[PDB]
Amino acid sequence: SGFRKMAFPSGKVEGCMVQVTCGTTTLNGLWLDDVVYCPRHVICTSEDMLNPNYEDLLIRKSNHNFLVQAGNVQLRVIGHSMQNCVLKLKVDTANPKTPKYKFVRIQPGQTFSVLACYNGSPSGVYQCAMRPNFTIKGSFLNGSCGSVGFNIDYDCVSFCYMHHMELPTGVHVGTDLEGNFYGPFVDRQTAQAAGTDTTITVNVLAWLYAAVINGDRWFLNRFTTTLNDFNLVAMKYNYEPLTQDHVDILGPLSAQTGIAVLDMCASLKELLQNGMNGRTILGSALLEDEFTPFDVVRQCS
Amino acid sequence: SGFRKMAFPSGKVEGCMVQVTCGTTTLNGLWLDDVVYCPRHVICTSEDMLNPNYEDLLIRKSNHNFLVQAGNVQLRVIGHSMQNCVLKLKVDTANPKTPKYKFVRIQPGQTFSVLACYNGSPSGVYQCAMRPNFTIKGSFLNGSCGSVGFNIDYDCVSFCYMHHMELPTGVHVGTDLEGNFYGPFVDRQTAQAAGTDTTITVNVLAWLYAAVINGDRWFLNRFTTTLNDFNLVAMKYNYEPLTQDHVDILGPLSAQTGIAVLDMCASLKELLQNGMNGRTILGSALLEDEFTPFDVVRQCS
Ligand SMILES: *C(=N)[C@H](C[C@@H]1CCNC1=O)NC(=O)[C@@H]1[C@@H]2[C@H](CN1C(=O)[C@@H](NC(=O)C(F)(F)F)C(C)(C)C)C2(C)C
Ligand SMILES: *C(=N)[C@H](C[C@@H]1CCNC1=O)NC(=O)[C@@H]1[C@@H]2[C@H](CN1C(=O)[C@@H](NC(=O)C(F)(F)F)C(C)(C)C)C2(C)C
């Protein structure tokens, strides 16, 4: 019993973290096989960052300009190329600690574990959700770029995120491991804004099943609702429309607890219009949308 | 920028997790050098657990009765002994992945990272605080016993906790890595109760410094207070007395932000008597006491 914001065991990813230094700039890199992946603003000076021309900056660099360090060992760079906003540095040594891996592009609403690094040294691990406006509510200081977001399926590490920037609102933005940003952001030091964020409805309902599995069941009411009547009520609260695909994903939890998805929508509909009346759910006073149905099935089954 | 409940990178501990099976019972073990540490109720049947005599159960066992598995490899047990509520099994192979380590007894109020395991396989990592009533608010299913709590000082793993039980209230109890329970609990399946829990005052103030470092500063008032006048007001809210030792520990944060500890106590005193008036601090609607001053200095400096 018990429900906690859990992160994946980061050990497989720790063995891949390297420190990439170019000129005076130092950030983190992901060393998988004979290639190191890192944000392309490692080739920037502080003056360059206000408006950089990464293609112009990179042509002026050679393999020896990049200082890659794996612990105390310096890895000799034998090739370099840029894929969108990521820089790939081929090295003479393949990582013996390289786990089984794939590079995926997560969808908004899905979660991942962030392994926060500084100087190629992991410092901490925490769980994040890719918001519908394509930002994450992380905790990143200077030098944290190149810290990656990942999920673990038994023995396979699916890397889905690489840290690049922090917005004026405090939220964090980054790319997939192919260099493509999540959201309409560019890697230049200029004022940038994220779109309107919405509440991930399927995650709130999944978190309500986790609450029932844990004995918190005061919000359970006797009514049912239609998917259409739930979406009209939830619309004014900035809740994304719950689709049939979301109802299908909620199946395993609904089968386990014996509470139909549409009966749980009627419970949430009351919580939306009437509030919590000073009560808490799973210790929290606010409804939570950062736990996906799979994250709930992971701990509560 | 950003403030998150962060856990230590669990990689060093993952390389120490083994699966200990005796008879039909299977739980986790911590393999450091040539010794495996595990809860002593691995030698119990389900009937034995209501009221066990572990000394009587263990004398009936020999080295071959214990099945220790490190991945696919079975470790041959060449010795066994019981230290309080932990069982130590000497093995013929010393763990090549054993990190630099020490065994510590944490104080109430301090935090640690829990690496949750099942069948000797790590499944997740999360941060816990040892409550003043000696319980933790974890998330443990069946077979999670032997999952350890730890802190990492650069390269040294200080193991401070091992999971044993879940109380009727939902909270979790365990021993240090010497077999001594935290709190007045016994490892038998009987109704057990934890004492009255209190609010860790020094952690609330540390979390208020993290909030100011992050731009959340609406609660900052113009007043100061004495340590004595703060403790009298906080007493009725079930806040533990803030001692001079706590004020000294809060020094680094107070120096960094430029807010005196006694000025932050006056801000908290207002929050205690007047409430939050519908406002949140660091996104939370309730005051938080699970982040120690060192946890704040870790991310916010
Ligand atoms: C990479 N190590 C840092 C991580 C930053 C440090 C503070 N928290 C973070 O997320 N990334 C940067 O410093 C990038 C980098 C130049 C500027 N920058 C930013 O994240 C800036 N933000 C933006 O420009 C904005 F608003 F568009 F997102 C900064 C003002 C420093 C927070 C480049 C090349 C984009
Ligand atoms: C070890 N793998 C489990 C972990 C349990 C499983 C559910 N969540 C947990 O923390 N530990 C046990 O099953 C121990 C074990 C017998 C009973 N037990 C308990 O934790 C029970 N609780 C208590 O007896 C109580 F209330 F005193 F804490 C249980 C009712 C199963 C939750 C022994 C030997 C104590």
Author numbering:
A (entry chain A), B (entry chain A): 1 to 301
Per the authors:
Severe acute respiratory syndrome coronavirus 2 (SARS-CoV-2) encodes a main protease (Mpro, nsp5, 3CLpro) that is essential for virus replication. Mpro cleaves coronavirus polyprotein 1a and 1ab at 11 junctions with a conserved Gln residue at the P1 site, a feature with no known human analogs. The essential function in coronavirus replication, together with the absence of closely related homologs in humans, identifies Mpro as an attractive antiviral drug target. The SARS-CoV-2 Mpro inhibitor, nirmatrelvir, was found and developed as the oral COVID-19 treatment Paxlovid (nirmatrelvir/ritonavir).
The crystal structures of the Mpro mutants with the greatest reductions in susceptibility to nirmatrelvir were determined in the presence or absence of nirmatrelvir, including S144A, A173V, A173V+T304I, T21I+S144A+T304I, T21I+T304I, and L50F+T304I. The triple mutant T21I+S144A+T304I conferred 27.8-fold resistance, whereas the A173V+T304I mutant that emerged in all three selection schemes with escalating nirmatrelvir concentrations led to 20.2-fold resistance. Crystal structures of A173V and the A173V+T304I double-mutant Mpro with nirmatrelvir did not display any major binding conformation differences. The T21I+S144A+T304I and A173V+T304I mutant Mpro enzymes showed more than ninefold reduction in catalytic efficiency (kcat/KM), implying a possible reduced virus fitness if these were the only mutations in the virus genome. The ITC experiment showed that the binding potency loss in the A173V mutant compared to WT is due to an entropic effect, while the binding potency loss in the S144A mutation is primarily due to changes in the enthalpic contribution to binding. These biochemical data suggested that S144A and A173V were each the main contributors to the changes in Ki values of the T21I+S144A+T304I and A173V+T304I mutant enzymes as well as the decreased sensitivities to nirmatrelvir of the corresponding mutant viruses. From a separate selection scheme, an A173V+T304I mutant had a different nsp13 K94N mutation as well as an nsp3 N1543K mutation in the ubiquitin-like (UBL)-2 region. While the single T304I and most of the double mutation patterns identified in this study exhibited low-level resistance, two specific mutation patterns A173V+T304I and T21I+S144A+T304I showed >20-fold resistance shift, and, therefore, should be closely monitored.
